[PDB]
Amino acid sequence: KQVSWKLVTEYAMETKCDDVLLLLGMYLEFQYSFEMCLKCIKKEQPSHYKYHEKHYANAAIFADSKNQKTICQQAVDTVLAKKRVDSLQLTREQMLTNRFNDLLDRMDIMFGSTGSADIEEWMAGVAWLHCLLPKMDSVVYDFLKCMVYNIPKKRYWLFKGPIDSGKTTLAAALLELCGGKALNVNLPLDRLNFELGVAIDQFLVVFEDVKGTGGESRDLPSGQGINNLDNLRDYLDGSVKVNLEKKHLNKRTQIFPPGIVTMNEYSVPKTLQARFVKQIDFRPKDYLKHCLERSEFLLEKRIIQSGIALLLMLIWYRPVAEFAQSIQSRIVEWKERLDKEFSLSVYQKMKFNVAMGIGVLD
Amino acid sequence: KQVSWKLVTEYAMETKCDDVLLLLGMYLEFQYSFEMCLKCIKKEQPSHYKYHEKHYANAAIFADSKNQKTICQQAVDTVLAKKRVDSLQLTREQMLTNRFNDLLDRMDIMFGSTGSADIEEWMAGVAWLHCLLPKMDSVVYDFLKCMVYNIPKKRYWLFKGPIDSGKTTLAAALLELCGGKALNVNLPLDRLNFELGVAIDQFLVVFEDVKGTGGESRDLPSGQGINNLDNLRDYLDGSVKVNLEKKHLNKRTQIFPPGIVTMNEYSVPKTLQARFVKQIDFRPKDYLKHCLERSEFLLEKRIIQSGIALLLMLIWYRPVAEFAQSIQSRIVEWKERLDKEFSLSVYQKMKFNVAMGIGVLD
Amino acid sequence: KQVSWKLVTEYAMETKCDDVLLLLGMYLEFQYSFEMCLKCIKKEQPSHYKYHEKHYANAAIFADSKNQKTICQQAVDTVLAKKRVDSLQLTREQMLTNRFNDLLDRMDIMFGSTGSADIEEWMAGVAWLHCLLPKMDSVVYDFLKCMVYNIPKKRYWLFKGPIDSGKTTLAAALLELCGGKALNVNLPLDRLNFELGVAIDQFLVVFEDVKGTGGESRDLPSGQGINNLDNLRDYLDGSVKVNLEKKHLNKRTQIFPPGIVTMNEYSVPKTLQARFVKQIDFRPKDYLKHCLERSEFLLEKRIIQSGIALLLMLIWYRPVAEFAQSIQSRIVEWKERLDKEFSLSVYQKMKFNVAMGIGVLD
Amino acid sequence: KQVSWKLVTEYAMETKCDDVLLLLGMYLEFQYSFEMCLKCIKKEQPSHYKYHEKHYANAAIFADSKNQKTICQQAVDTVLAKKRVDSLQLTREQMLTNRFNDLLDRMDIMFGSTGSADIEEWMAGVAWLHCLLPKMDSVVYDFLKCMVYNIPKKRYWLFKGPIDSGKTTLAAALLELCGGKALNVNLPLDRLNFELGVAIDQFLVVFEDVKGTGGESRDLPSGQGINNLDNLRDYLDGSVKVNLEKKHLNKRTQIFPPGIVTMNEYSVPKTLQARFVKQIDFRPKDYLKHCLERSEFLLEKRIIQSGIALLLMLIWYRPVAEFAQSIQSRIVEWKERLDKEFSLSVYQKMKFNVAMGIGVLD
Amino acid sequence: KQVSWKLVTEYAMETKCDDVLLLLGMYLEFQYSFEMCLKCIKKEQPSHYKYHEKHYANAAIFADSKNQKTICQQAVDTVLAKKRVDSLQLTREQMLTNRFNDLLDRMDIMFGSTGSADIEEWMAGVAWLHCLLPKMDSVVYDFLKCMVYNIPKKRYWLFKGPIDSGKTTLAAALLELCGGKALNVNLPLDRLNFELGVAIDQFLVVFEDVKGTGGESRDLPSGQGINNLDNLRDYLDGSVKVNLEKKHLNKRTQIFPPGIVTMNEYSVPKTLQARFVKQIDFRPKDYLKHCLERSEFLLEKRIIQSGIALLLMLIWYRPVAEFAQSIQSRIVEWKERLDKEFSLSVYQKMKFNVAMGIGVLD
DNA sequence: TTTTTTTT
């Protein structure tokens, strides 16, 4: 009798494993009897204990195969092919739908029976989120939908604001919920051609603060950014496809993704200003600085800039109807838990602790 | 009959051998009758003499095969696969506990009946090391915990200061203890691709005497070191995953390992300086040299570079409860052996001899 | 009937051959009847005529095979594996002891019945080198010890002197004796990657006339030498492992071997001066030149730059007890043969002639 | 029935062919019925017409093979393997002897009945060459001895003179005589890596028209050559092996060949001047020009470039004793043939014509 | 039943195809029923309709093969092998004779019954070209012989004159007639290396439009080319071999091919002037311009660009004895066609019209 | 796939 290549391929699909070594390693673990399997008994890892008993007979024969890496290479191809199909076929909303469902799986397990971070800390995370600026959940929801629609011109917001104003901290966090990258335009125009290639295939993008050419009138350093960006008419508009470039590599073309421009409190051409839907001046805030100094568990469990923290803020504020239609069930199922475990008073109290800069958990 | 690839792969696992040439050479030694094997008789290498009798029959049949490198390739991939599975599943504490078991097994041999090392010399090494900086064991205990907790923007400590001030000496001992990697960045910005590629699946990394720009007024030549350092601060923050390269293999994404950086008293952008929890500056002391000059077996046997010396130091200084739980059995067993073999007065004799700059053994 | 891959592998072990083309070429020669083999009758190459009769029967079947390069590849891998195993398990003293046995075997051939070398001419070379510096044989013993002990950051010797000072000549003989490699560093800082990759598993290295800067004041055209080397301080220090690269191969990690650097009298950053444990200064001396002019067979046979000549010097000058215990047997036979073949008065007649700058022989 | 790979290997060996495509295309020609082969019947190519009839039957079966390029690859390997065996085992004298045997075979064809060459035209070339420098044939003999002996730091000859003075003409003939390669060092310092790679296994090399810097007073266009070349001083000296590189290939290690440097009349750094064992001035002369204008069949047939011309000069001038012992038999036969063809008066008449600047013939 | 690899190789040989994909695609088309094949019925492409009926049976089995690309590779190799045999063995006269046969085959189609060309319009082309220079037909015949004999120094021709005076038109037709490549030497000196790499194995080269320096007074834009050419003396004189490079390939060594240089009226150094056999002056002539206006089917169909036009000019003007002896039989048949198709009065009326600057046809 | 080319 012989290895079923089919069963190996199922496991790769189910785990969504797409590293051949990782697939090989884990599947070999099943070769011992599941009947006594201590990893199963300890319930350490679902990717093991959910599967061992089913795969056991096949894994034994797999361990005797002389061909093992070849089996795994085909299985990894299957998962990569699946991704490339979906990546071409599906809508931006379907794509965001799936990423929500993915992060809602981390929501599921992180506070599952292992509880390996206390959900309450993430409530305090939500508190130090929603303090930041007016209606912060709605400002998120608005900018999120703006980026899903990817409507031409209506695509770029201007995060003005000085040093440590938090703009980078927030925009970086949002890319967990979506994926993307940040960019540089202060490096001179000969380099810029290659800098632009970093935007390729990004679901979202962001820009570094312009060291704007005029900013040293404000004593804000003047790299090439302002005149560079003011000249890049289409890229912001996303009206048509454009070419993009990388070292040692050929050109490619697509519509240039939507995004964010951050800056310090720079001077700007009215033409470049006309490229933006919004401008906001972020600022450091005197409660918030001391509150973080007093609330550092939010940094320790890596809460603050997690998409999971944005996801909770979103789940807490936003109506079920505002979410991806089928996932709305899962949204109810978490509105259940979050409002079950946490009163509005502790939530309000936590926000009031920020409202006085005292440490959030109290 | 035919080769058991299974028996080959077991040896590769139990040696934890992960080089295909090394494995091939090793296994071919077993083709002779262990009945006369001089290496067995000499008890020359455990990786041989423990296994020769068991594998002899299979090695004879292996010696005739025409597939020999292919057999070894599959066996090596099994070992790499095991590492990759541990890499993602284990806690950083669990990793460290494994690492310590490996070192303890080696010490069991080194000071065993084979006994090629004598612990008095290594204890003199401990004395020299604990003399090198105040409360050395305690500063080590801090670094270990910091490295296990892996707190972002706090993942790195920097050593500054003149040559021959021991920063390398200490880095070497810690790196052996942790099983990290050294890395270089004083290099073409592009070629960092595979260099950082080595950071795949490592607990810890070290960057050596990396070059500032300016300070050549003090005979410190400018170089790409500090450029590449103050660039890549995300790798020092560690809040961010990076995709890492190897030849003829996929790129793989992970959080970059935490680490140590070292320099002489170069220039350093404050933007980079922000990343380091401790930034300690190392400077020479001469009585150490006079001791070394009189104690040169310390350097000749590289004792003061070994992580083994640090582990001996931690056994001597730290409470049993400060160790990870499972090994505390072995900790106690070694504390017995140390405190049995050495009075404190012997350790005093050593340590004042060190401080006095006289030969430690006396 | 079929090819024995085993017999091929033995021949590669026997010859220590490790180029697949050289292996293939030489094994093919055995296809003709050794009974008639003109090369055997000439007794021209030992690696042929020792083996032809044994391998003839298998070579006839190899000559028909369709796999030939594959059979040779496996054999070369077996030899390379043996090197890897030895490199990881021998003491440096055993490695050197093996190297000396190989040279002694060549000497047995050279001065054997085939006797192509004249031991008088070779001993004249010993007199010339023993004259080149004070206490020459003592200096060689010091260097050997230093390379065997391999004390970290006490690992490199610097040779300085004007052109035709003889520093290259001395370095060449030492390099043959220990079997290192020479390397160039007066080079662009990128391709150093594959250049230094040659040092993998080598016992010793030499860097040549390494170009400094500001040298035109002394008519030394400046270059990248000193610039590059004061980067690689760790490679000199040998305090930690480093990663070495080859084409189509992933990096190998190991300590970088000890060695020698040669220098016309450029400037030196003391960051670099710190790492040479010793420097020797060389001077042109015209009477040696007159001797060479009258004694051209020294150069034509390259005698004065062969490690064979250094070995003969050591046999003449050093106690038998200084040699590693096993070869002391062979050493005694060569001491006897030398004392038989030369009176001291003949050697004194030579050293006198060398001092006079007359042709060595009279 | 099946293809004899052995017969293909024989054909490759006998034709000394080492291009897989040329070997393939050649062997395929034999598949047509030998008895009609117009290439045979017109006696156009010895590499065809000697072999077609022998190889015919196997060529027909080879034409049907599904495996054709694999068969050719194996055959080409054995030809390459033989070259490497020879490179490591022949004396430099034997190499030159073999090279001479090959040219002498070509001369048997050129002046055969099938031979198109006019021996009188080729002998006219020798007259022109013997005029180009004093004691021309003695100079050739001295150069040959120098190349055979390959004495370190006494290995390189420098040619200089005005443009149109004869220098590359003479270099070309020596290079065809000995075999070797020309190289251009007036380059950026990076691609020197692959440029110098060409020297692998070569006997001679020639550096072509190395450019100095300054001396544009003498209308000399400046370039990298001299300053660049002075960095490679050890490649000239040849005291020690060096490492050489080809595209997509690992570094080879060997001693860098001896050879010739050509330039117009720049000045030379005496670090490099010291390395030239001999220097030859070339000067324009009117009678050579006027003779050559009236003797253009010399140029039209490339006579004065070609190694056959230098070989003919040596056969005329040098004693039989000076040739390596085995070729003395063929040398004697060629001497008889030449003396039978040309009286001394005819040769002296030619020389007098050249001196008079009339066309060589009369 | 089996695929015949032989029948594929015959098709590849007969089509002279040497792209695997082009070979593959065309063979697959034959799998459909030849008897109704629409492409056959249209007589659309000779590479198809001549062959479909023959290969149909094998194409059907080929369509089921699992080895398809492997079969094609071996076939394409056979075509490439034929080219290298030819390149190394044919005389330059035979090369040209082959090239003419290819053009004559295309003309048989073009002016066939299926032939879409009009022999009258193509003869109008010849009338215009014969007016472009005095003695045009003799000038071509001289150029061809100069290329065939390839006599050193006597190798290169210079085309000179104002912009829009036809020089590149004539170069292009000659380049099509002989086969060859254009090259641009106006580059900086570094990239010239890969540029000249294009010349490998070519028959002719054209140096397009080399820019001088100065003559900006005459509005001529300056550039490197003239200086670069003056630095390539040996490539032009073609007396000795040179090394040539391609991307990702090792160098090859050959005589650099003969060719043409073209320029506007820059000043030419005498060093460069001496390199050229012949200079041809091109001048604008209004009557050609007004003729082209009223005869633009010449331009539209690219008639005056084509080597096919020049071949017709040779056939009309040259005696049959001037052609290579084998093709003289075809030449007579084409002369016979042309004599039947045009009286001299018809042709001379066209020449008169061109001299009037009137449209060619009346 | 890298290496080489590109990049610089």
Ligand SMILES: Nc1ncnc2c1ncn2[C@@H]1O[C@H](COP(=O)(O)OP(=O)(O)OP(=O)(O)O)[C@@H](O)[C@H]1O
């Ligand atoms: N309101 C705030 N007041 C003070 N500190 C803050 C505030 N918000 C965030 N921070 C802290 O400051 C860090 C830096 O913030 P961030 O980089 O996002 O600011 P920035 O405005 O984009 O800065 P810069 O203009 O200097 O690039 C944050 O990661 C957080 O630790």
Ligand SMILES: Nc1ncnc2c1ncn2[C@@H]1O[C@H](COP(=O)(O)OP(=O)(O)OP(=O)(O)O)[C@@H](O)[C@H]1O
């Ligand atoms: N504080 C010290 N006092 C005296 N000797 C020291 C001291 N620290 C190190 N050494 C000696 O200096 C030599 C090198 O030590 P080490 O490489 O660790 O220093 P370093 O400061 O890291 O040097 P570098 O800057 O060259 O890397 C060793 O011989 C070591 O014993």
Ligand SMILES: Nc1ncnc2c1ncn2[C@@H]1O[C@H](COP(=O)(O)OP(=O)(O)OP(=O)(O)O)[C@@H](O)[C@H]1O
């Ligand atoms: N001390 C000496 N006195 C005189 N002649 C010497 C001396 N040493 C070497 N020679 C001569 O100089 C030649 C070259 O010697 P060597 O290459 O070893 O010198 P070097 O100083 O290392 O030179 P370089 O800097 O050119 O590499 C020797 O072959 C010998 O002919």
Ligand SMILES: Nc1ncnc2c1ncn2[C@@H]1O[C@H](COP(=O)(O)OP(=O)(O)OP(=O)(O)O)[C@@H](O)[C@H]1O
């Ligand atoms: N000594 C000479 N006197 C006169 N004419 C010469 C002389 N030597 C060569 N010639 C002519 O000069 C032509 C070019 O010679 P050669 O190819 O050796 O050129 P070069 O300028 O001397 O060398 P290079 O190009 O290497 O600098 C010869 O083909 C011949 O026509």
Ligand SMILES: Nc1ncnc2c1ncn2[C@@H]1O[C@H](COP(=O)(O)OP(=O)(O)OP(=O)(O)O)[C@@H](O)[C@H]1O
């Ligand atoms: N002798 C001529 N007299 C007038 N017009 C001409 C002549 N030769 C060419 N033409 C016109 O010039 C146009 C371009 O010709 P062509 O491209 O050969 O010119 P060129 O001067 O050789 O160009 P370039 O130097 O830019 O490559 C032709 O299409 C035709 O219209």
